[PDB]
Design a binder for these strands. Structure first.
Ligand SMILES: [Mn+2]
Ligand SMILES: [Mn+2]
Lengths: 431, 434
RNA sequence: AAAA
């Protein structure tokens, strides 16, 4: 009988990886977790322990071992002496990656002593987050797990206690349905413009005049009356009106983008703004305005990454996708623009066409927190912005947080990366 | 004779500073075990933290630095210890093993337990509990609460976390007290009176419409008379926020507006002041610019700060050391951060981010920001409070939305909303100190 | 300071 002992902290991912790699070699699994004691400010990791048992399919081979106090050696040793299985194991393997420092020292030294009898082989190991290696005590076996252990997005979110997972594929992208028969032409025209280095020109026009016409009061594009009132206000600026700029200063590559939309979903009438039924207005403008206001950039980047990832053995749906959402039980949903899994490292990618320092900064804080919540503390966050290189470098330094590794866990791309964004993400993710 | 304290320098310097402050006076030597930098194994150095610890604990020549080449490798760790741990005769070796990787902990603990297993050398190990603020001993079985005994100031806290060029304002040096000299107290007391009268939600509604419709447009709208008068003529033709200002403004907001000096009033009597053609750009800016920026959000900063100041002094916190307004600092050659209010209870940093906004999306972004900031400057056990203008339901949603599990039952991200403004002083007091 |  051979037993593997895992220490259940609040990062289930390392225990999942070690367990996936070693489960075949063991007959019993002891998951050591914390009880909830509100009066010493101690939450339980039982919920993680259950998820580990569940996704590692341990079933009847799993023993759960609760510790009443994970900060007190005395009580830790007391609970171990009382509760640790007293069977005649021939090998006891403790992986001491998870948990508090005291849990580690005292579980380690408890087990080494309890099983000192040389009929029993004691082994300790540790999953190194920096170099993706399982290191054994005194053995220098040093096996890299970086490329060997895989996880899909459903398992990753599940062990971090997220549920109701939804995302989209290239074949299920929602705007492909909203723009029937025209999506490909639309996305081609946009991809052509970005590859021709017109992204900055595009975002400038989107900011002015596009957002000045089609973004104002809430439900502006849902009530024909409110929209015409907005049109007549802007016409008061005369030659300085956004409408005049729309009609007279729009570049040909933007007219071609606008004219790629289906006849009944175009913002223009000839080379002129369409000046207006509420449901007929919504059917004409709603999806088109929402797509042009930024969703297009989500699709563009996703289609640039897909190719590279297909060559790399990743499986769409399991290892990458677009428009990820999920929730903890009875809790609000998050939204992440693009996810990618390299081995067992989550890379969350957040996209904005903004060039403004303040807005991109806030999006940075957001993507850092989300990948931590859903993929754990060793996840990578990428922010793709419309900022110049100087601003992206500042933002990287501004939000950098130190965790002991030499590689950045928060990376910022900018307007000059848009044309070759697939290659830039390939380089950054697969290092 | 000689007694040595051993500390493991991870990337969270605060625990080590706290254990060191508590035990400094009882030890003759301090060994700071830190990591070396090696890009091949993706391993950064914690030397910068070790050096801040030596500095801010005033260790001087009693400090021995001990570098580890590889903090994931038991054999290299033991080798480095064998070669670099001081060889003098010690009567006591105390290892506090709170910091570092788990392999650092296990092998440093066991290396020292073995090396100093003599009958007359006292070996001790301790652990600082982040959850109940207890220094816990392995062999003596002591458990000593440090929550109220160990203190730290904002300058020391930010410095050990590698921040520098620290600035902030005092109650008596607050910036708007100069822009409304002779009138600040009257203005803020009128606002305070209304917010304490549960007019918060009404105030914010009015600020959104019509106040922000009239006074928030193009950049420098309120400093160019032509831009402002054009803007007003456009609004007048429309209904009009000018009509709503003149006809639908509640009495308590007239009382706030009328608390400003006459030359800083937005109103001309019981109507909106409209600049005449004789009004220069300077006249327009001098009348309106500071008043508008205050009413558009800055007032909230002063309001919340003023509601907690007496409570903090009553708890013997020292302004400037343990609390303050408009904190800014930076890492070397890096952009500055801005934090609306900071507070320090014992050694836990509380950062408070304020906004009058009631929109979910904006309040969520500010939530992410204060979470990250207090982590950067105060470490992993800091608390972030976000005070918004949202209703209770949106405030509760946002707390659960951004909640992150680190093993504690007390939340380290707290959100307050419009319903909390009238008693925000006691709300923060109960939240922070209980 | 519960994969530093
Ligand atoms: Mn986005
Ligand atoms: Mn604020």
């Amino acid at each position: 009988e051979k037993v593997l002992v895992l220490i259940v902290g609040t990062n289930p991912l390392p225990n999942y990886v070690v367990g996936s790699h070693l489960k075949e070699k063991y007959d019993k699994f002891v998951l050591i977790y914390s009880e909830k004691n509100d009066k010493i400010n101690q939450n339980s990791t039982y919920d993680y322990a259950k998820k580990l048992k569940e996704h590692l399919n341990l079933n009847d081979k799993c023993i759960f071992l609760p510790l009443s106090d994970v900060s007190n050696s005395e009580k830790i040793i007391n609970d171990l002496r009382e509760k640790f299985p007293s069977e005649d194991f021939v090998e006891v393997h403790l992986n001491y990656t998870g948990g508090t420092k005291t849990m580690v020292v005292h579980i380690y030294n408890f087990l080494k002593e309890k099983f000192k009898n040389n009929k029993i082989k004691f082994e300790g190991s540790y999953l190194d987050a920096r170099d993706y290696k399982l290191v054994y005590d005194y053995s220098e076996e040093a096996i890299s797990l970086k490329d060997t252990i895989k996880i899909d997005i459903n398992t990753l979110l599940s062990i971090h206690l997220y549920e109701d997972i939804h995302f989209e594929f290239y074949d299920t992208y929602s705007y492909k349905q909203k723009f029937v028969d025209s999506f490909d032409k639309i996305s081609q025209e946009i991809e052509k413009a970005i590859k021709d280095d017109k992204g900055e020109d595009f975002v400038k026009w989107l900011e002015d005049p596009f957002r000045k016409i089609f973004k104002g009061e809430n439900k502006l594009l849902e009530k024909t009356a409110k929209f015409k009132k907005h049109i007549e206000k802007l016409l008061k600026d005369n030659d300085s009106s956004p409408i005049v700029k729309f009609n007279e200063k729009t570049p040909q590559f933007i007219w071609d983008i606008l004219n790629a939309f289906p006849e009944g979903k175009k913002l223009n009438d000839g080379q002129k703004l369409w000046i207006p039924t509420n449901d007929n207005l919504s059917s004409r403008v709603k999806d088109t305005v929402e797509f042009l206001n930024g969703k297009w950039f989500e699709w563009y980047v996703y289609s640039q990454i897909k190719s590279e990832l297909l060559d790399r053995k990743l499986k769409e749906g399991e290892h990458f996708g677009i428009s990820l959402k999920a929730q903890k039980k009875d809790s609000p949903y998050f939204a992440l623009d693009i996810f990618l899994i390299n081995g067992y490292q989550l890379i969350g990618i957040s996209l904005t066409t903004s060039s403004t320092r303040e807005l991109c900064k806030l999006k940075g804080f957001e993507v850092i927190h989300r990948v931590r919540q859903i993929g754990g503390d060793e996840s990578k966050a990428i922010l793709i912005t419309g900022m110049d290189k100087s601003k992206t470098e500042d933002l990287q330094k501004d939000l950098a947080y130190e965790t002991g590794s030499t590689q950045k866990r928060f990376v910022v791309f900018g307007i000059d990366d848009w044309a070759d964004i697939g290659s830039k993400i390939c380089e950054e993710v697969f290092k």
